[PDB]
Amino acid sequence: AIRDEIAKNTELSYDFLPLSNIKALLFFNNEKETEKFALERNWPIVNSKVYFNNQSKEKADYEDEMMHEEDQKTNIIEKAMDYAISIEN
Amino acid sequence: KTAKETKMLMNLHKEQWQSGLKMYDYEEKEESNLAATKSMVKIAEQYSKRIEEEKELTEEELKTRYVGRQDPKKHLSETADETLENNIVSVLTAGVNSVAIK
Amino acid sequence: IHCLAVRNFKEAAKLLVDSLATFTSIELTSYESIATYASVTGLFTLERTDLKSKVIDSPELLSLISTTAALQSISSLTISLYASDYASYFPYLLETYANVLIPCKYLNRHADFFVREMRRKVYAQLLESYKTLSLKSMASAFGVSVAFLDNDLGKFIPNKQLNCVIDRVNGIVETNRPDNKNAQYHLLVKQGDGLLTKLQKYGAAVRLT
Amino acid sequence: MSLQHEKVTIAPLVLLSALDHYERTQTKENKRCVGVILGDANSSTIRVTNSFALPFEEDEKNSDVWFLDHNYIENMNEMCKKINAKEKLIGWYHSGPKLRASDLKINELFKKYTQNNPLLLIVDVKQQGVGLPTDAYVAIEQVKDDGTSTEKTFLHLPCTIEAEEAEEIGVEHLLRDVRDQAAGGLSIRLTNQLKSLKGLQSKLKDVVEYLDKVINKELPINHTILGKLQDVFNLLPNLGTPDDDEIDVENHDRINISNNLQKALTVKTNDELMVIYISNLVRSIIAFDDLIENKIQN
Amino acid sequence: IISLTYKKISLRDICLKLNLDSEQTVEYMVSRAIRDGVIEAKINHEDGFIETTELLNIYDSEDPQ
Amino acid sequence: ILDKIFYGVLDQGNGWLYVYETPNQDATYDSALELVGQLNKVVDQLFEKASVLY
Numbered sequence: 001a002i003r004d005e006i007a008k009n010t011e012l013s014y015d016f017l018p019l020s021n022i023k024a025l026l027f028f029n030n031e032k033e034t035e036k037f038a039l040e041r042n043w044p045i046v047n048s049k050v051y052f053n054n055q056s057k058e059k060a061d062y063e064d065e066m067m068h069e070e071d072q073k074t075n076i077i078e079k080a081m082d083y084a085i086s087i088e089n
Numbered sequence: 090k091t092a093k094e095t096k097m098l099m100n101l102h103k104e105q106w107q108s109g110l111k112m113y114d115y116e117e118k119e120e121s122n123l124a125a126t127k128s129m130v131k132i133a134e135q136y137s138k139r140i141e142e143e144k145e146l147t148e149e150e151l152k153t154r155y156v157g158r159q160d161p162k163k164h165l166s167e168t169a170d171e172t173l174e175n176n177i178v179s180v181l182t183a184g185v186n187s188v189a190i191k
Numbered sequence: 192i193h194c195l196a197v198r199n200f201k202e203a204a205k206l207l208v209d210s211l212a213t214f215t216s217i218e219l220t221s222y223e224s225i226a227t228y229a230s231v232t233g234l235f236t237l238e239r240t241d242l243k244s245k246v247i248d249s250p251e252l253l254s255l256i257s258t259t260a261a262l263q264s265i266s267s268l269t270i271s272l273y274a275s276d277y278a279s280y281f282p283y284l285l286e287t288y289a290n291v292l293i294p295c296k297y298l299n300r301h302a303d304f305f306v307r308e309m310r311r312k313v314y315a316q317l318l319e320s321y322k323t324l325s326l327k328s329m330a331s332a333f334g335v336s337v338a339f340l341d342n343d344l345g346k347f348i349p350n351k352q353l354n355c356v357i358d359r360v361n362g363i364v365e366t367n368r369p370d371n372k373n374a375q376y377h378l379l380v381k382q383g384d385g386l387l388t389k390l391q392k393y394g395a396a397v398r399l400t
Numbered sequence: 401m402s403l404q405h406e407k408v409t410i411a412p413l414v415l416l417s418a419l420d421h422y423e424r425t426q427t428k429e430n431k432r433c434v435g436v437i438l439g440d441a442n443s444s445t446i447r448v449t450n451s452f453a454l455p456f457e458e459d460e461k462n463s464d465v466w467f468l469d470h471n472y473i474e475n476m477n478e479m480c481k482k483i484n485a486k487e488k489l490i491g492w493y494h495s496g497p498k499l500r501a502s503d504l505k506i507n508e509l510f511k512k513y514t515q516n517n518p519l520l521l522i523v524d525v526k527q528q529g530v531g532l533p534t535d536a537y538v539a540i541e542q543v544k545d546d547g548t549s550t551e552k553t554f555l556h557l558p559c560t561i562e563a564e565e566a567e568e569i570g571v572e573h574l575l576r577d578v579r580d581q582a583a584g585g586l587s588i589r590l591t592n593q594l595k596s597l598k599g600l601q602s603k604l605k606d607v608v609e610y611l612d613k614v615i616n617k618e619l620p621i622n623h624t625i626l627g628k629l630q631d632v633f634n635l636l637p638n639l640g641t642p643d644d645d646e647i648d649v650e651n652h653d654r655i656n657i658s659n660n661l662q663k664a665l666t667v668k669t670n671d672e673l674m675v676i677y678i679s680n681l682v683r684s685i686i687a688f689d690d691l692i693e694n695k696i697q698n
Numbered sequence: 699i700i701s702l703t704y705k706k707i708s709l710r711d712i713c714l715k716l717n718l719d720s721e722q723t724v725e726y727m728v729s730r731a732i733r734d735g736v737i738e739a740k741i742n743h744e745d746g747f748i749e750t751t752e753l754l755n756i757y758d759s760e761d762p763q
Numbered sequence: 764i765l766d767k768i769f770y771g772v773l774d775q776g777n778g779w780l781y782v783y784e785t786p787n788q789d790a791t792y793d794s795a796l797e798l799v800g801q802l803n804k805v806v807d808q809l810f811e812k813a814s815v816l817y
Contacts, residue, residue, distance in 0.1 A: 009729035013741045021743055025722070076651070076763065077188075080181045083658070087173075088587060090574060096527055097415050098571055102581045103531035103559040106599030109592045115650070119791075122657050127794040129664070133801040140671075140808055148679075166668050169661045174586035176658050180651065182593065187647065189597070191637045239765060275765070320764040322772035322781060345703040356705040360747050363776065365705060372649075373757040375792040379656070379799070383663075386802055390666055393810050397674055400816045645758065652762045653791060660795055667802060674813045681816060 003027070007041070011052045019048040112182045125172045132168070135161035192219065195228060195297040198304070204232040211251045223259055226252070227291060230265040231298065234272065235308055239316075243273060261291045272313070277332045280313060311347045318355055324364045402516040406444040408536045409562035410521070412571055414439075414448045415534060418493050418523040421453040431458040433495045434506060436473055438480055438487035441516050447562060448521065449486060451493055452476065463502040470509065489513050496524035499537065499554060507539055520554060530595055532559055546624075701737050706747045 003026045010017070010025060017025075023034050038045050042055050102108075139161050145151040152158055194203040207229045216222065233246045246252065247269065257263040264287045271280045284306065292302045317329070330337040347353050355366045418435065427433045434456050439449035457467035473489070480487050492510050494503060503520065510518045517539045524533035537554040544551040563571070580588055607629075613619050637643075700707055700715070713724045728748065731737045738752045756762075764770060771782040 006726075006729075009726070009733050012732055013725075013729045013739075014743060017743060025725075077181065077184045079763070080177060080184065084177045084181075084586070084590065093419060093527065094416060095574075097419055098412055098574065099577070099579075100530070100532050100581065101412070101561055102583075103529075103534070105531055105581065105592060106596050106603075108583070109589070109596030110600070119653075122653065123791050123794060126657065126660070126791060126798055130794065130798050130801065133798060133805065136805060137801075137808070140805070140812070143812060162668070162671070165664065169664045169668075173658060173661045173665075174589075176654050176661075177586065178589055178593070180654050180658075181590075183647065184651075185593070185597070187637070187644075189600075191639060316765070320773060322774040323776045325776065328775070345699075348703050349699060356750065357703060358706040359704060359708055359711065360706040366772075368772075369754055371755075371757075371786070372789050372792070373755045375789060375796075376652075376656075376757050376762060379792065379796060382796070382799060383659075386663065386799060386806075389803070389806060390663075390670060393806065393813070394670055394673070397677055397813060397816060400677065648760065649758065652757065653789070655763060656795065657791070660798065664798075664802065667806060670806075671809060674809065674816070677813075677816055 003037070007037070011056065015051055015053050016049045022050055110182070110186060112179070112186065118179065121175075122172075125168065129165060129168060132161050132165050136165060192297065195232075198301065200232050200236050204229075204236050207232055208245055211249070223262070224295070226255060227259075227261050227265060227295065228298075230262070230269065231291065231305075234265075234269065234312075235305065239273075242269070247273065261294060264290045272316075275316070277313070277317065278334050281334050284309065310343070311352045314344065314347070315353050318353055318364075318366050322366055326362050326364060329364060401514070402442060404441070404443050404516065405446055405519065405538045405557065407560060408446040408448070408519065408521075408557055409560055410448045410534065411439075411450075412561070412563050412567055414451050415523060415532070415561075417451050418495070418521075419525055419527075421451065422495050422525050425453055425456070427456065427458065427495070430460070432456060434468060435493050436477065436489060437491050437493045437519065437521055438477070439490055440486055441488065441490040441519070445562075446490065446519055448490070448519075449484075452480075454492075463500075464505075466506070468506065468509065474513070488515075490516065491518035491520060493521045493523055496522045496533075497526050497528075498522075498524075499535070503554070504539075504552070511539070530599060532561075534559055701739055701748070701750055701752075704748075705750045708747045709741070710746065712748075 006026055019031065019034075023031060026034070026037070028034050028037075035045055038050060044051050044054070139157070142151060142155060142157070145154060194200070194206070207225075210225065211229050214222075214225070230246065230252070233242055237246070252266075255262070257266060264283070268280070268283045268287055271277070271283055288302065288306065292298050292305065298305070313333075317324075317332075326337050326340065330340040333340065335343075341357070344353065344355070344357065348355065354368055354370070355364060357364055414437070421435055422428075422433050425433055433453065435451050435453040437448050437451050440447045454473060455467070455469050459465045477487075477489055489510075491514065492506070494506075499522065507518060507520065520537045520539065522535045522537065524535075527533050536557045536559050538557060539552065540555050541550070541552045543549075580591060582588055583592060610625075614621060700712060709721065709724050712718070713721060716724075718724045718727070725741060725743075728737065728739060728741060732739060738750075739748050740751050741748055753759075764772065769782065770785060771780055773780050
């Protein structure tokens with residue numbers, strides 16, 4: 001859980017890290033273990049450099065759309081209605 | 090009277106469908122908002138005068154003796170509501186257009 | 192005088208400049224005292240254009256020259272502030288502290304506060320006209336070391352008055368200026384929270400009664 | 401003849417009257433009535449003051465066949481002028497329900513009398529729509545090249561109305577309603593807005609089905625119409641544009657002013673509360689003492 | 699504080715000032731801090747400095763509503 | 764720049780002078796703050812007179 005924690009903080013910090021630094025941060029003993037954690041985490045390894053930006057953003061977008069957060073958005077037109085009718089009640 | 094006659098008299102605006110989606114050109118809205126705020130600053134000064142008093146015996150006596158008419162209270166209330174409704178319609182119209190049409 | 196004693200200098204200035212011209216003393220301090228007070232406030236609050244008009248070209252100050260050490264120090268500071276001289280500004284900063292602020296009773300308690308305000312103000316003044324400076328240039332100009340300048344800028348940056356960011360890697364002093372509709376939006380909401388607050392409580396009170 | 405026809409305002413009496421005439425001749429079951437429309441013109445503003453029925457026979461079989469007694473119109477008219485010179489023969493009303501190309505034959509006859517292009521006033525008697533069931537059309541003759549050489553055609557002009565003061569007091573006197581076409585207060589204008597949307601939705605539907613009929617029931621392609629729909633799509637707003645950002649900023653100013661106006665009014669109400677309450681505090685002192693004196697009186 | 703002041707600040711300088719243990723430690727504070735977004739920065743490991751990214755202006759945003 | 768003649772910023776490190784148009788502060792926002800200011804004073808006075816009720 002600790003390696004996961006580190007990986008998440010360091011996601012936003014920086015997109016691309018040298019191979020040596022990905023290992024050192026997460027305190028892995030071996031490079032192969034590093035690439036195991038990438039695949040599980042759905043991150044491309046391209047020239048022994050991780051890239052965090054793509055999937056995480058897409059996923060985020062998809063997660064955002066659900067039957068909960070639709071009534072909590074509040075539409076600008078909806079805000080207007082409510083202000084008007086409260087006067088006129 | 091008949092309800093055929095009544096309906097005819099009642100409708101008196103064929104440009105209803107247009108005019109409510111019609112919004113005023115925008116240079117005039119900006120102008121107006123500044124005028125309204127700034128003008129209320131001046132009727133607030135007059136408001137302050139009004140409530141220096143509020144001590145004379147009998148509300149009605151105050152209105153005669155120190156000429157309490159020329160009532161700032163009434164002008165600020167009028168103005169605020171007039172400007173208020175205008176802005177409700179403005180935000181609604183522009184916002185409706187934007188989504189319906191695109 | 193009452194206002195000179197409280198922090199608020201804004202009302203003090205307005206009253207103070209008119210009274211250089213006119214006031215026969217009555218149970219209050221001499222006109223030499225009163226002269227140094229108008230000069231002091233003038234620095235603090237006044238916009239640049241208006242310091243020049245009302246104070247430097249003052250008929251009163253010019254005729255009165257300097258027959259006192261206190262009046263001399265404050266005058267020397269004014270001339271370098273307006274002229275954008277910076278080398279001599281700092282000797283002058285130190286002088287007014289000794290010969291003006293401590294003798295004067297009312298301005299003694301604000302000694303720290305004044306020098307803070309002035310030091311922000313000058314740094315500010317120079318930054319307004321330059322998009323960039325290098326650290327060496329700015330430090331040589333004020334007459335302090337580069338190290339002494341850095342520690343001091345960073346005091347006043349989170350309190351927002353100098354409006355500048357500082358690169359360490361390239362040695363450069365960038366000056367951001369993003370004040371626009373954003374500035375004014377924050378002022379209105381903050382003060383707004385306070386009007387709401389007062390209103391709620393007085394409402395509740397009367398309703399009970 | 402005249403271009404002076406740029407607005408048509410119609411007295412509430414004209415609209416009322418035409419509708420009545422339709423049943424006092426007993427023309428129904430998709431039978432037209434044509435009557436003369438009397439009033440002012442020769443002006444940008446046309447003001448239809450009044451109307452009168454004309455004997456009419458409609459024949460469905462041939463639309464080349466119709467009865468209109470010419471001599472009747474002219475006699476009836478001239479007496480009307482002596483009461484009021486205001487009335488001139490300015491055209492003829494048609495009971496609808498729709499524009500026809502058989503309206504054109506009728507048009508020519510009335511154009512002999514007139515000194516302006518006859519106004520062709522379609523008072524539809526099916527009383528459809530949330531707007532008026534009255535379209536205004538003036539016969540324009542224009543030179544146009546589309547294979548045709550010179551077209552004569554009926555062009556829409558907008559409908560508005562105007563009312564005389566006396567007639568207006570009479571309209572309210574009938575109604576118990578305070579009216580809602582007014583575009584009055586804040587309530588009314590929100591109402592009208594909702595009406596305006598429901599209005600639009602219908603018009604667009606009708607466009608959709610026209611296109612359908614051309615690609616399935618082979619109405620001949622009319623180029624002119626499609627040309628216009630093409631622009632409708634070319635001048636369409638679009639999202640992702642910094643245009644949108646501006647509108648959003650603008651929106652921020654407008655909420656700022658509402659916020660302040662509403663807070664001003666919280667003060668005004670608070671001020672009322674206190675005021676009425678001083679008046680109550682006085683009333684209690686009075687009430688204590690009055691009771692005491694009443695004990696003596698009893 | 700260090701961010702508001704500085705647009706590029708070497709991570710090496712931050713390690714002396716807040717007397718932080720190692721170069722790895724100074725990174726981790728900033729890494730975790732940006733998760734709640736209090737600082738909003740970006741770390742450059744290789745270039746060996748932090749560059750401020752802070753929007754500052756939010757009038758432009760939907761937020762004022 | 765200090766006297767607001769041409770109002771721009773001199774970039775010492777490229778050897779250039781950058782020129783801006785006059786900035787236009789929002790009049791509405793400034794005038795609004797004056798009104799709000801006033802409202803506070805109003806409420807203070809009212810309340811001192813309302814001290815009678817309590």
